[PDB]
């Protein structure tokens, strides 16, 4: 019955100072202990400071410097705080729970773009047969979440209630946008009678696209 | 504090095969080590603790094993999805990871469709036409974006995915997007494949107002 | 990489002697120059006195014979203290770096109601719809904090991982009290699963409230 | 000391538009003046020095051009982030700023919600309404607080929120208030709006014991 989330800015311009919230359930932070740990976009994970359940905190000599963790009980949350970023301090951010030396559950996972612009919505277009596939089984649907940062997406087929034959593959980057391109396979029974649908979200764009995907005529 | 060293960056074996992975640290870790497992956007999973202690869901392929430096990960019966980076963790001394080790299967074979813009997509100015191209085994490929006849070669840009839990293929979007323009100076549109898994390509098409 | 942080009172009683604190980083204070520039409530931008590389201080006249600039290296702090404030002094003060002539880096940001009152921490109540809005994708929420002061609370809705659509609308003057009102806008599909709250915090009043916003019922 | 003047105090234009800005000494500046732009809330930034160079990271559409006491700053091609208030300081004689320039620009449109006093709010014998408008053009609103029929005109304050470092819109909070007494002493709570978007007016409304 443990937790773990975890609560940030999406963007923070260099210079500044990141500050996330770990936000525990199921236990009690006065009987554990929660740390910070990062995978650095292109990195390995790395521990960055520990946060007793006696108050102490431990920090990453090498991130000590800069990062400064601490909590806040009768709310229950651990908290961060880094000042003073580079670019190689982007990707995704998570904080744990911690038992005889290591971290038994927690982890629900947190991202984390760092450079100096701003946002920008996700553009949602279908993706459907120009007539072509009709009688097999057995249709491959899609759609492309275009032109978004700083970073991700996150399409769900309908409703999450297909699940197999989903296919969103990652995405590239633009003139300094993101975009991706999901898919979906489905037998062709459900793609008529019974609808299918994307379903797009970009938290850091409050974002919250639905796009139903039709088939074409012409 | 202990720096941590996972020996083959890169393992690929077989369903069934059993594979043996490494760790050593710097300094005597006495018996303080940690299986991480990450599986590519997801919270690193706990897979064994202190050397070698099954963490309370990890089925029993997992198995830990070591003394002071150096230490191992076995997975006696490579499943399918068992594909992901592994780190060791290491808290004797002071609570540091590991390079970590990929671990791709081995398998074989493709799978492709297109699509073209949406009323939409077009409707402002621009036209972005993607060939897909799932499941396909020897990860590598290679496609190439016609046009009546062209062949445009770019202006697309496409990704893969990662190693499937279940069904050890890889996956490949790419698109090829134009102004709207010229997308809407042809009727023709097309992108051949190619693999290995045939010799005579593969390519899907796709003519203007139709569909 | 050059910062420029300042600390100081919040408050000051009138008569008192006010005195901040520039903390310089990136640089060094014997290679540069420092100097305090304040914005007077209701007023434009005016030069205090400027500290040397080489320990000179120079005065603006007028400010001279109640404001005395100085400096520690050791520490990397230029400080302010100015006997004898009227509540015309009132407003951010901000330390700078100085070239040729001007500044080109530094300026974090540092207010200061200077009044013969005191402080009174912030009352934070919750802004939601008397049933009303419903299915629309976009639901607008709030947190109304009142009665504090001095100047300024600083509210982040859901940690700061909203932004988009968040809009703290400035204060207003009460009974010698100050109370503002932030909202946010969200896609209804995140009011309901997953849950939108403020925060709140009124730094001379070591102040952290917040205010999550449930749905009224009624 | 030198006195600067801003003489526009507050100019607006729209995207793309190119302007120009002012600041002039009572005493020959000698060409060393200095343009430091604001932006609610953020520390002033140094576009251009020494009369007219460039800092190192202001964009080009930024210049500088004078002459012992007449200078001046324009930004060709004005953005939609360049809202913000220009202040121009002069350290020829003796350091002193300018009473700034206000800068906004075009675009038009509203939106409005309603919100009576909380739980809270409420049981502290303190009932507070408000009616927010978000994102609207031109700045010009009027607002109406009126209560079955009624219409109580007072006891009542707003604020309006800078122009969009985004949407170069505004926005407006106004929150009426009374006892835990009468606004308990009635059900019926309404808020007319009043644009220019439109002609007929916007008004939400809510009923006591209702939400």
């Known amino acids: 019955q443990v937790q773990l989330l975890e609560s940030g800015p999406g963007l923070v311009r260099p210079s500044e100072t990141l500050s996330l919230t770990c936000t525990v359930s199921?236990?009690?932070?006065?009987?554990?202990?929660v740390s910070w740990v990062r995978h650095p976009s292109g990195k390995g994970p790395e521990w960055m400071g520990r946060?007793?359940?006696?108050?102490?905190?431990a920090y990453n000599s090498a991130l000590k410097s800069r990062l400064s963790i601490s909590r806040d009980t009768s709310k229950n949350q651990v908290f961060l705080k880094m000042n003073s970023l580079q670019t190689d301090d982007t990707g995704t951010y998570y904080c744990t729970r911690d038992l005889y030396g290591g971290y038994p559950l927690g982890f629900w996972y947190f991202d984390f773009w760092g450079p100096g612009t701003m946002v920008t919505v996700s553009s949602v277009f279908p993706l459907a047969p120009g007539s072509a596939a009709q009688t097999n089984s057995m249709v491959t649907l899609g759609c492309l979440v275009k032109g978004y940062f700083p970073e991700p997406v996150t399409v769900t087929w309908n409703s999450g209630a297909l699940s197999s034959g989903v296919h969103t593959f990652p995405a590239v980057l633009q003139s300094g946008l993101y975009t991706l391109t999901s898919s979906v396979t489905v037998p062709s029974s459900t793609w008529s009678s019974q609808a299918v649908t994307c379903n797009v979200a970009h938290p850091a764009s409050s974002t919250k696209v639905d796009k139903k995907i039709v088939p074409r005529d012409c | 504090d202990i720096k941590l060293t996972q020996s083959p960056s890169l393992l690929s074996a077989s369903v069934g095969d059993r594979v043996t992975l490494s760790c050593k640290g710097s300094q005597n870790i006495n018996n303080y080590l940690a299986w991480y497992q990450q599986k590519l956007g997801e919270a690193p999973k706990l897979l064994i603790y202190?050397?070698?202690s099954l963490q309370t869901g990890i089925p029993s392929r997992f198995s830990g094993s070591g003394s002071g430096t150096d230490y191992t990960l076995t997975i006696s019966s490579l499943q399918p999805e068992d594909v992901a980076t592994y780190f060791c963790?290491?808290?004797?001394?002071?609570?540091?990871f590991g390079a970590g080790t990929k671990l791709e299967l081995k398998r074989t074979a493709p799978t492709v469709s297109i699509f073209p813009p949406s009323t939409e997509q077009l409707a402002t100015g621009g036209a972005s036409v993607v060939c897909l191209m799932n499941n396909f085994y020897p990860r590598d490929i290679s496609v190439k974006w016609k046009i009546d006849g062209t062949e445009r070669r770019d202006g697309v840009l496409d990704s893969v995915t990662d190693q499937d839990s279940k069904d050890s293929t890889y996956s490949m979007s790419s698109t090829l997007s134009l102004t709207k323009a010229d997308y809407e100076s042809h009727n023709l549109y097309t992108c051949e494949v190619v693999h290995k898994t045939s010799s005579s390509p593969v390519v899907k098409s796709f003519n203007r107002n139709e569909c | 990489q050059v910062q420029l942080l300042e600390s100081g009172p919040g408050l000051v009683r009138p008569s008192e002697t006010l005195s901040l604190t520039c903390?310089?980083?990136?640089?060094?204070?014997?290679?540069?120059?420092?100097?305090?520039v304040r914005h007077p409530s209701g007023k434009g931008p005016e030069w205090?006195?400027?500290?040397?590389?080489?320990?000179?201080?120079?005065?603006?006249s007028a400010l001279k014979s109640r404001l005395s600039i100085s400096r520690d290296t050791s520490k990397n702090q230029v400080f302010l203290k100015m006997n004898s404030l009227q509540t015309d002094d009132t407003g951010t003060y901000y330390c700078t770096r100085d070239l040729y002539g001007g500044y080109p880096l530094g300026f974090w940001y540092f207010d200061f109601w200077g009044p013969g009152t005191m402080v009174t921490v912030s009352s934070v109540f919750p802004l939601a719809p008397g049933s009303a809005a419903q299915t629309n994708s976009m639901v607008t929420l709030g947190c109304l904090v009142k009665g504090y002061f001095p100047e300024p609370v600083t509210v982040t809705w859901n940690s700061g991982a909203l932004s988009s659509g968040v809009h703290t609308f400035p204060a207003v003057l009460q009974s010698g009290l100050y109370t503002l009102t932030s909202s946010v806008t969200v896609p209804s599909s995140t009011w309901s699963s997953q849950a939108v709250t403020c925060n709140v915090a009124h730094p001379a009043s070591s102040t952290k409230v917040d205010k999550k916003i449930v749905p009224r019922d009624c | 000391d030198i006195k600067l003047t801003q003489s526009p105090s507050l100019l607006s234009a729209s995207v793309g538009d190119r302007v120009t800005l002012s600041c002039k000494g009572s005493q020959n500046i000698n060409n060393y003046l200095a343009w430091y732009q604001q932006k609610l809330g953020e520390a002033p930034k140094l576009?251009?020095?020494?009369?007219?160079?460039?800092?190192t990271g202001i964009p080009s559409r930024f210049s500088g051009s004078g002459s012992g006491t007449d200078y001046t700053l324009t930004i060709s091609s004005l953005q939609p982030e360049d809202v913000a208030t220009?202040?121009?300081?002069?350290?020829?004689?003796?350091?002193?700023?300018?009473?700034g320039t206000k800068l906004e620009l075009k675009r038009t449109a509203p939106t409005v919600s309603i919100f009576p006093p909380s739980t809270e709010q409420l049981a502290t014998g303190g009932a507070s309404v408000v009616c927010l408008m978000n994102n609207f053009y031109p700045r010009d609103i009027s607002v109406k607080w009126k209560i079955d029929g009624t219409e109580r005109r007072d006891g009542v304050l707003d604020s309006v929120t800078d122009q969009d470092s985004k949407d170069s819109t505004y926005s407006m909070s106004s929150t009426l208030s009374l006892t835990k007494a009468d606004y308990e002493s009635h059900n019926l709570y309404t808020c007319e709006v009043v644009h220019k978007t439109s002609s007929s007016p916007v008004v939400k409304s809510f009923n006591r014991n209702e939400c």
């Open positions: 963790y290491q808290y004797n001394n002071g609570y540091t």
């Open positions: 946060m007793w359940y006696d108050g102490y905190t």
């Open positions: 202190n050397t070698n």
């Open positions: 199921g236990f009690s932070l006065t009987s554990f202990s």
